[PDB]
Design a protein around this ligand. Structure first.
Ligand SMILES: *[C@@H]1O[C@H](CO)[C@@H](O[C@@H]2O[C@H](CO)[C@@H](O)[C@H](O)[C@H]2NC(C)=O)[C@H](O[C@@H]2O[C@@H](C)[C@@H](O)[C@@H](O)[C@@H]2O)[C@H]1NC(C)=O
Ligand SMILES: *[C@@H]1O[C@H](CO)[C@@H](O[C@@H]2O[C@H](CO)[C@@H](O)[C@H](O)[C@H]2NC(C)=O)[C@H](O[C@@H]2O[C@@H](C)[C@@H](O)[C@@H](O)[C@@H]2O)[C@H]1NC(C)=O
Ligand SMILES: *[C@@H]1O[C@H](CO)[C@@H](O[C@@H]2O[C@H](CO)[C@@H](O)[C@H](O)[C@H]2NC(C)=O)[C@H](O)[C@H]1NC(C)=O
Ligand code: NAG
Ligand code: AMG
Ligand code: AMG
Length: 257
């Protein structure tokens, strides 16, 4: 009933108890991923998340409150209970606030903030601390492809050698250009028919994505899903659109060698 993993988030860095110190109150931060004990988090049935025998704890339950390690039996019960929604948030149920990395840099301190479904609020509980590299196959068994910064993504015939068909699926729930990992698949707005492009990763809600059980790729803020516009691949436009279950909204990842 307990199991232990790393927690990967913004820019692929991991949740780390600062300096590897275990004294009560030590803040959680981002740090490059590794096997050190202060990056190993044990998820217990009681909804606690523990490292070095102590609990992930809200040091306060307000917008901007720090998250720290603290003795599990002395901390407040409301402050040590967490849930892990399927869209990759880490939420403190009492406050409704979510774990947020406000900057990408190593040593950024993790805070509880209002949920805006930002990529800075996406996390992946996993033992694989490297991004998973895959082609994204969709409508007509075509592949989603990059075409440079500030340019639309679109469908092309899948080719094992096309580097612009290769995507790094990061722990912060961003979908990145594998060969240029500072660039993220981004919706150019939150309205139906807004275009999906590549832009510099900035931790925004427009850059957060979820692969759901219906084969959809969902943008949690807008609720809308990637869609090959009008089921017409020669338009070379992928948009966000309400989920219909239709073939032009169905996707699957295929891991690359
Ligand atoms: C919760 O904390 C967030 C981080 O401090 C607030 O967002 C930040 O607000 C700053 C102004 O106080 C602003 O300069 C920052 O750009 C912004 N950061 C980001 C990335 O959102 C947030 O404030 C709300 O949202 C911002 C964008 C403004 O519209 C504010 O007027 C809002 O109050 C805080 N949320 C709440 C509800 O207090
Ligand atoms: C969390 O705080 C608890 C209460 O202060 C610690 O338990 C206490 O540890 C004292 C010093 O080690 C010990 O003499 C006390 O009898 C005990 N108090 C209670 C109410 O159990 C606890 O330490 C852990 O649990 C105790 C019982 C021993 O097994 C320690 O060696 C454990 O570390 C604190 N937990 C942690 C992880 O620090
Ligand atoms: C995706 O991009 C990554 C990062 O550039 C590539 O990984 C590098 O691969 C080279 C050659 O195998 C190694 O020297 C490095 O160790 C890798 N870097 C990292 C950070 O992992 C990768 O080859 C690309 N393509 C695929 C399919 O993964
Ligand atoms: C698909 O888009 C192309 C290119 O814009 C257009 O010429 C073509 O007629 C479209 N096909 C349909 C069925 O609309
Ligand atoms: C020098 O490494 C130590 O400090 C850094 C930075 O604080 C991290 O906490 C890391 O996990 C810990 O081993
Ligand atoms: C009439 O709907 C068709 O076009 C819209 C865009 O106009 C969406 O792409 C939708 O999924 C597709 O079925």
């Amino acid at each position: 009933t307990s199991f232990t993993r790393n927690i990967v988030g913004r820019d692929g860095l991991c949740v780390d108890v600062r300096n590897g110190y275990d004294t009560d109150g030590t803040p959680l931060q981002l740090w490059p991923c590794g096997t050190q004990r202060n990056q190993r988090w044990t998820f217990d049935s009681d909804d606690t998340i523990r490292s070095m025998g102590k609990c992930m704890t809200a040091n306060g339950l307000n917008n901007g409150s720090n998250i720290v390690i603290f003795n599990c039996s002395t901390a407040a019960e409301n402050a040590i209970k967490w849930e892990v929604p399927i869209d990759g948030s880490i939420i403190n149920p009492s406050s409704g606030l979510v774990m947020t990395a406000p900057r990408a840099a190593s040593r950024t301190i993790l805070l509880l903030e209002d949920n805006i479904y930002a990529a800075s609020q996406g996390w992946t509980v996993t033992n694989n601390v490297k991004p998973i590299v895959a082609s994204i196959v969709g409508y007509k068994e075509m592949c989603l492809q990059s075409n440079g910064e500030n340019n639309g993504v679109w469908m092309e015939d899948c080719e094992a050698t096309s580097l612009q068909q290769q995507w790094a699926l990061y722990g912060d729930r961003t979908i990145r250009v594998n060969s240029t990992r500072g660039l993220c698949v981004t919706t150019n707005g939150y309205n139906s028919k807004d275009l999906i492009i590549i832009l510099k990763c900035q931790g925004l809600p427009s850059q957060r994505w979820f692969f759901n059980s219906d084969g959809a790729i969902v943008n949690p803020k807008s609720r809308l899903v990637m869609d090959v516009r009008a089921s017409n691949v020669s338009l070379r436009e992928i948009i966000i659109f309400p989920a219909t279950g239709n073939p032009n909204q169905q996707w699957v990842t295929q891991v690359l060698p």
